[model samples]
Target: TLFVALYDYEARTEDDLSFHKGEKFQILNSSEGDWWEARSLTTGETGYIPSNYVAPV
Candidate 1:
């Protein structure tokens, strides 16, 4: 499974990850609240994203 950034993000919040629209990612951790851990498929950067920011595809 994979994830796609539906829209561009540039760390507007302290916990947000910097990413571009359509960037692919593989989920690393997701068990808690609205935030999840993911590793970018393109950049190998790992960070938190809002549940509303991404979805499975």
Candidate 2:
């Protein structure tokens, strides 16, 4: 599904993907609890992002 970033998040680990506020994302997985696996529409990169930093588009 699609989502929009609510805040800029810097990647904390290699598996974490960074994004700026208002960026779009393709949510790949949300079963990891507080974090989700997603693909960045801005860079076509895949990694984890904090679920609280994004909202469904």
Q: Which numbered prediction scores highest in lDDT against the true structure?
A: 2
lDDT of 2 by residue, 1-57 (tens): 689999998988889998999989988878877878888898999999888888997
Cα lDDT of model 1 by residue, 1-57, tens digit: 898988888887656688888988888788856688888999998888766777789
**Can you tell me which runs of candidate 2 are displaced by over 4 Å?**
none
Q: Which ten residues in a row have the lowest lDDT in candidate 2?
A: 27-36
Give the TM-score (vs. native) of candidate 1. Answer: 0.83
| RMSD vs true structure, all candidates | 1.5, 1.1
Estimate the overall C-alpha local distance difference test score of candidate 1: 0.82
Error of 2 at 19 (Å): 0.5
Candidate 2: residue 45 Cα off by (Å): 0.2
